[PDB]
Design a protein around this nucleic acid. Structure first.
Ligand SMILES: Nc1ccn([C@@H]2O[C@H](COP(=O)(O)NP(=O)(O)OP(=O)(O)O)[C@@H](O)[C@H]2O)c(=O)n1
Ligand SMILES: [Mg+2]
Ligand SMILES: [Mg+2]
Ligand SMILES: [Zn+2]
Ligand SMILES: [Zn+2]
Ligand SMILES: [Zn+2]
Lengths: 426, 513, 417
RNA sequence: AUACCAAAUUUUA
RNA sequence: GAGUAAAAUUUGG
RNA sequence: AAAUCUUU
């Protein structure tokens, strides 16, 4: 009869209310922690029990061993993207008797950021409390190592490590007409999205799972799916250029308009895809490859696209290409967004604002500066004082971003939007 | 010693102040400051900035996130028994359930739709009306918040009515949405360090940086300004009702109801107050009372001052300052080039709270410090060793430990003084896995939680182990709960399983490859 | 999926069964009729035909798979559905007048909106207030901090002895002598003895603050850690003398004196009088059996004792030392003294901060951080940020603020920035 | 115009 | 007695 | 009695 007491007068309540009412209350101790632990030797008894019973049952965790060289760097946000369980996986685990609430809790993609001031040669991600020592999350076939690298050391004559055709282990997903063809080398399947699922003959296919994750759709099995023209074989036997770039958070790389290559043994990118030194190269890679959904923009995607269009209306072809690349980088694939900055309507309110700003992965870019050739042609030099500060280096001939002392004008300068930091043609 | 640091140091090494003072004095002082601001003598509470450019949200569907309306944090519940108003402190879950019981409504969204749909303030929505709801939602209870470093006099905080919380959730959600759509650089969800980095990037084209703060922030945000912003973004009658309750708010101090016609009672609407300034200009990077705007000339400084005055963002002359070699926001100080400012920064000490919790918290603090450039790693391991010795001095007595095995820490009778690096890279005896920052709960934490729980009637039937795809906004009755539990139990039995096996994403992902 | 149709779906599945008892139509909005572990593709599911049914209005498509049957409800008279059976089922079930309520929008204007708006207009409004004239000037100089410290010293002066701070040094008595002296001091003060413990009883209070003065600095505090640990231990072991390696204290509960039915044991809110020993040579000297020691007291509430006991002196000192400049020698009054100053006095200051439960030194430190980082500040207002004497009360917090200001002054004296 | 939950710990306003 | 809001970690569901 | 509307 407790239901009639907690919810007197109501016969039905939401699951949220019911669950929130079944949370066990906690009484905050008036004492200090030490006195509470000493009370009745409760901590002593807990320690005895833990050593006697629980400690033997604790599994042994693996020791971390892989290390890389690291150097002092600007303060950055290391983005860790931990995918959650997919819908079918959670359904099967629930049907297998695993706790439904815990399984649901793992159902959501997690994105977190860590403040770290240490960079590796390969822009690797680091463990907690060990960035200064260079302990990496990545763990050391040559082909797999070359796939995840922007600039492979040893090309192997195939798309994975350079220009060429498709190796055996590489699959690819491409969009033809209104269907998504996934070809792996042995099996070829076709997929479509009815309303919110991704209908395919066999959703269990690894390429099908990757495509569903890239499109953020629940995999579904629909035998009555098939396309008319499937030139996949030709493109599988054709050769394509390899954009020199790190793998996007989805673990794949773009090789053509709405087409991405995937490697079986590469789960997800273990290096930061978008950084200060590689943002504009990545934007130029996908100039005309359509939306990618590879870079997270701070704020609203629609507002960012409006600013991008407003800057796109005024500018030279190079700036227009860079802006279109940025729009493709930030626009999710398949969502109701108009990334193409040629059919998108020009927003007057965006033009009202004097400066145009977009934040991509913690990098603040002024689109007006991009239009006037700053991040790629000339740096922005602002004088900070006419006196020399102690502990600051002299201004180089092609300074990167940072604070320097210029003897030619005996002044402290803050260099930003440097082509030596964003373009870095080397 | 904090005065002789070569770099920046907030002075966080010791704990914050404690106070057993009653909350009456601080609450009365805050109300008096609000009244003085209202009379128009010290600070501005009249908003004159232009908000006509804010996008209108009035056509968006009305959605309520029920998860925001339930929690263990306290709230004020009002009862009219014999013509008198009695305000009692309860939990937000209990207050929300009482509100939904008073007016027969299954979900908060149904309640808000019913309230918006009535045709008379006297019309009944159960055992209440919109008039009674507005009357009751203006009452607040005062409490004291202490343990804030740098504040010897603890601040006054206010517990609100569930109806006020319900309307506030909607208005604040939409204000955050408009901030995301309108801000020059979105920072309503960034961390302090992320805000500092974005600010450093933003102000790198100007010479002078105004490290700014506002004084009496919540007292100078008037109901008129809130209503102005809400009308600009299109909150309809919800904004009108909320502003009406704000203007007529009363606070229960001791045993007296004190009217507070001015202010917004200490951060009730952070997003709306932020929009009050962000909706009039794009020259600031700010959330609540903290902005990092920059300027080049004295004329630009005067324009910034005028904008701040017009937005009701009174500059704090005590704390605001100008810098050229650094920039600070959210207590995070960076150099103009973006590097973290050398020094301890916000590094805090770890008070003794148990043999193993102290070591775990010290390890977490040192890992955070070494991830940044605050201190090198050898300094961190030396500090961890010294902390282990201090813990051994404090705790190695018969009232806590009786063991002597080597692998235990010296504070529990062992002789192991682990290295920080060895602990971090899981290169320790399994007993040390709890001391790792990312490890499981320590023995002290489990003992403390058990002690808190074992402090007391009747419970509702457990509604655990649901289908991970069922939305939580669906309705359930007692019979429905029993039937769902029975069906799940039958399914588990058919699988030959007792209570479901706990699922850990980490272990499952380890078995997957 | 929309809750708007939930109730409507309940009408569609009205006690219809198949396979002689099993329910035919299962509503996606029902927590009992839902099939666990099956993704939802429509408003309801027909098990007999193994199909999905979703209800829509004219020209109002819903996001469902194409396979789901659309049971369109034309506004005028009828419902059109591709399947004939479902059309018949709806025509039968919805015969009773039942309409789908419209979607409520955030900017909805209620019928009472104008009345409440007028009510608000009739209520008080703020006045504009004056715009401040801000002058940006250089940050305060050494003379300003000197003036602040001089004003504090002039207004409050100094105590003759260090009082409880002197307890940071050994009292020159062995454990037996220390215990005897503490117990005899408790007896001399007429503390009640009960259940093997000492209790301080009170009847009336003057309801006025105690005398506030600055504490002169002892030479050093070798026993800082021991003193803090003893304060921590005394939080509940009150009434009996507690011993460390080199010193000991006695925490006496302070309970009201009813006269016959008086509190016999402390509760969570009871205050403590912490009594410590130091070397003699002040007005607090106490003698017994040839043992002389200065017996000092400190009245704390439980929160203050908890805050003081938990501080880690050694780790705090090491963390500060990590990036610390050279510490100068200072005198008993925080004045630079190269000839006769002692650097160890800095330790004492640290201990004082641990003893100061209001931690005003934290506010001073934050303001000094701003001062060191600042290029220009507001005239006459930034300086008025070190004036924190109004925010604290007591000898300990007052001395802590005074010596924090002295530290700022010494830093600007010996290491100008 | 529009286009995970709770508790605990630390920090931030 | 201990509120509003943000970030991160763990525990539980 | 003291860091005094607290020691309830
Ligand atoms: N624990 C906290 C701290 C801050 N806040 C909000 O943040 C504002 C600025 O906090 P502050 O400490 O700066 N006081 P504020 O009145 O601005 O005056 P001050 O500059 O200190 O003179 C407050 O007013 C509140 O809205 C809160 O809700 N809870
Ligand atoms: Mg402030
Ligand atoms: Mg600031
Ligand atoms: Zn290859
Ligand atoms: Zn194909
Ligand atoms: Zn004395």
């Amino acid at each position: 009869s407790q239901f009639g007491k907690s919810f007197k007068g109501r016969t039905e309540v939401t699951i949220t209310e019911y669950r929130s009412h079944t949370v066990k209350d906690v009484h905050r101790s008036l004492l200090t922690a030490d006195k509470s632990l000493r009370k009745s030797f409760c901590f002593r008894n807990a320690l005895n029990q833990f050593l006697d019973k629980d400690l033997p049952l604790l599994p042994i965790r693996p020791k971390l061993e892989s290390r890389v060289a690291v150097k002092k760097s600007k303060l950055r946000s290391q983005l860790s993207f931990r995918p959650g369980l997919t819908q079918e996986e959670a359904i099967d685990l629930y049907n297998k008797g695993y706790d439904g609430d815990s399984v649901s809790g793992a159902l959501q993609d997690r994105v977190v950021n860590e403040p770290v001031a240490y960079s590796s040669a390969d822009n690797d991600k680091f463990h907690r409390g060990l960035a200064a020592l260079g302990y990496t999350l990545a763990d050391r076939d040559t082909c797999e190592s070359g796939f995840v690298r922007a600039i492979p050391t040893t090309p192997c004559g195939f798309i994975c490590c350079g220009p060429g055709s498709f190796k055996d282990s590489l699959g690819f997903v491409i969009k033809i007409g209104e269907f998504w063809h996934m070809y792996d080398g042995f099996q070829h399947f076709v997929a479509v999205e009815d309303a919110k699922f991704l209908a395919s003959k066999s959703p269990s296919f690894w390429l099908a799972k990757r495509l569903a994750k890239r499109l953020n759709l629940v995999p579904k099995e629909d035998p009555s799916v098939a396309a008319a023209e499937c030139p996949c074989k030709k493109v599988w036997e054709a050769s394509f250029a390899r954009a020199p770039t790190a793998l996007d958070p989805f673990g794949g790389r773009a090789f053509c308009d709405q087409g991405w290559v995937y490697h079986r043994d590469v789960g997800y990118a273990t290096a930061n895809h978008i950084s200060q030194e590689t943002l504009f190269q990545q934007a130029l890679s996908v100039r005309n490859l359509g939306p990618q959904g590879s870079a997270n923009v701070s704020g609203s995607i629609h507002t960012a696209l409006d600013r991008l269009r407003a800057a796109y209306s005024r500018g030279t072809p190079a700036s227009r290409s860079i802006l279109q690349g940025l729009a493709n980088l930030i626009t999710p694939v398949g969502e109701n967004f108009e990334c193409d900055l040629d059919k998108r309507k020009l927003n007057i309110k965006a033009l009202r604002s004097p400066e145009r700003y977009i934040t991509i992965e913690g990098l603040v870019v002024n689109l007006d500066d991009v239009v006037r050739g700053f991040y790629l042609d000339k740096a922005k030099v602002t004088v900070l004082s006419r006196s020399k500060w102690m502990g600051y280096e002299d201004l180089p001939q092609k300074p990167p971003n940072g604070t320097f002392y210029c003897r030619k004008r005996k002044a402290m300068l803050l260099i930003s939007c440097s082509p030596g930091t964003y373009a870095k043609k080397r | 010693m904090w005065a002789f640091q070569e770099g920046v140091c907030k002075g966080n090494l010791l704990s914050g102040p404690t106070s057993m003072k009653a909350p009456d004095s601080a609450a009365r002082e805050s109300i008096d400051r609000a009244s003085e601001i209202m009379t128009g003598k010290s600070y501005n509470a009249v908003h004159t900035g232009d908000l006509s450019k804010l996008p209108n949200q009035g056509e968006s569907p009305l959605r309520i996130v029920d998860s925001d309306l339930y929690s263990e944090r306290s709230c004020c519940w009002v009862i009219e028994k014999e013509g008198r108003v009695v305000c009692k402190s309860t939990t937000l879950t209990r207050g929300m359930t009482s509100l939904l019981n008073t007016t027969k409504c299954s979900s908060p969204s149904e309640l808000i739709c019913k309230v918006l749909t009535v045709e008379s303030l006297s019309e009944k929505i159960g055992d209440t009306s919109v008039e009674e709801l507005l009357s009751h939602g203006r009452y607040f209870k005062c409490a004291l918040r202490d343990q804030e470093r740098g504040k010897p006099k603890s601040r006054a905080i206010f517990l609100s009515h569930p109806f006020f919380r319900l309307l506030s959730s909607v208005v604040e959600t939409h204000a955050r949405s408009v901030l995301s759509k309108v801000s020059a650089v979105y920072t309503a969800t960034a961390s302090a360090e992320q805000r500092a980095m974005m600010a450093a990037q933003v102000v790198e084209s100007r010479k002078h940086v105004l490290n700014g703060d506002c004084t009496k922030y919540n007292e100078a945000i008037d109901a008129d300004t809130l209503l102005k912003v809400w009308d600009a973004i299109g909150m309809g009658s919800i904004g009108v009702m909320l502003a009406y309750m704000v203007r007529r708010k009363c606070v229960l101090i001791k045993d007296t109801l004190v009217e507070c016609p001015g202010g917004m009672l200490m951060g009730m609407f952070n997003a709306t107050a932020t929009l009050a300034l962000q909706g009039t200009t794009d020259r600031f990077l700010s959330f609540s009372d903290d902005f990092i705007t920059s300027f080049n000339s004295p004329a630009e400084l005067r324009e910034i001052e005028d904008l701040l005055f017009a937005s009701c963002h009174n500059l704090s002359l005590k704390k605001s300052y100008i810098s050229v070699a650094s920039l600070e926001i959210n207590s995070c100080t960076l150099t103009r080039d973006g590097d973290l400012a050398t020094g301890l920064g916000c590094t805090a000490g770890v008070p003794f709270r148990g043999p193993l919790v102290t070591l775990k918290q010290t390890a977490a603090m040192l890992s955070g410090a070494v991830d940044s450039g605050v201190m090198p790693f050898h300094s961190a391991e030396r500090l961890f060793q010294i902390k282990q010795q201090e813990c051994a001095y404090r705790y190695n007595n018969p009232t806590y430990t009786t063991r002597n095995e080597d692998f235990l820490p010296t504070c529990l009778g062992g002789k192991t003084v682990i290295s920080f690096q060895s602990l971090l890279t899981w290169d320790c005896h399994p007993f040390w896995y709890q001391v790792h920052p990312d490890g499981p709960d320590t023995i002290d934490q489990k003992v403390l939680s058990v002690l808190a729980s074992k402090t007391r009637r009747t419970r509702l039937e457990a509604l655990s182990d649901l289908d991970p795809l069922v939305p939580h906004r669906l309705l359930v009755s007692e019979s429905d709960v029993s039937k769902i539990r029975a069906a799940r139990q039958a399914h588990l039995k058919s699988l030959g399983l007792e209570q479901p096996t706990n699922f850990n994403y980490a272990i499952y992902k380890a078995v997957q490859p | 999926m929309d809750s708007r149709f939930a109730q409507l779906t309940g009408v569609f599945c009205d006690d219809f069964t198949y396979s002689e008892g099993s329910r035919r139509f299962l509503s996606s909005y029902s927590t009992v009729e839902r099939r666990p572990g099956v993704p939802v593709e429509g408003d309801c599911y027909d098990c007999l035909k193994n199909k999905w049914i979703a209800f829509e209005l004219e020209g109002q498509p819903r996001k469902f798979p194409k396979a789901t049957v659309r049971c369109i409800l034309n506004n005028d008279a009828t419902y059109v559905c591709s399947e004939q059976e479902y059309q018949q089922i709806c025509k039968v079930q919805f015969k009773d007048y039942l309409e789908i309520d419209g979607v409520v929008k955030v900017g909805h204007k209620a019928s009472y909106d104008a009345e409440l708006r007028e009510r608000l207009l009739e209520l008080p409004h703020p006045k504009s207030g004056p715009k401040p004239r801000i002058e940006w000037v250089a940050p305060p100089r050494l003379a300003d901090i000197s003036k602040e410290t001089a004003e504090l010293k002039r207004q409050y002066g100094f105590f003759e002895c260090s009082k409880f701070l002197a307890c940071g040094e050994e009292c020159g008595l062995d454990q037996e002598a220390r215990e005897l002296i503490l117990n005899e001091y408790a007896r001399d003060r007429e503390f009640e003895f009960r259940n093997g413990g000492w209790i301080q009883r009170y009847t009336v209070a003057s309801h006025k603050p105690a005398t506030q003065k600055i504490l002169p600095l002892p030479a050093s505090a070798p026993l800082a850690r021991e003193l803090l640990m003893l304060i921590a231990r005394s939080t509940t072991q009150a009434g009996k003398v507690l011993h460390s390696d080199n010193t000991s204290i006695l925490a006496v509960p302070v309970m009201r004196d009813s006269g016959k039915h008086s509190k016999r044991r402390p509760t969570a809110s009871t205050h403590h009088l912490v009594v410590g020993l130091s070397k003699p040579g002040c007005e607090h000297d106490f003698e017994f059996d040839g043992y002389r020691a200065a017996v000092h007291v400190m009245h704390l509430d439980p929160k203050q004792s908890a805050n003081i006991g938990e501080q880690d002196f050694v780790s705090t000192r090491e963390i500060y030392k990590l990036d610390m400049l050279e510490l100068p020698p200072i005198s008993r009054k925080g004045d630079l003294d190269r000839a006769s100053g002692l650097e160890t006095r800095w330790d004492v200051i640290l201990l004082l901060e641990c003893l100061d439960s209001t931690r005003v030194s934290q506010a001073v430190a934050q303001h000094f951080n701003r001062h060191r980082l600042a290029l220009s500040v507001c005239k006459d207002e930034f300086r008025k940020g070190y004036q924190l004497a109004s925010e604290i009360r007591g000898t300990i917090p007052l001395s802590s603020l005074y010596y924090s200001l002295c530290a700022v002054r010494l830093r600007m004296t010996v290491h100008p920035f």
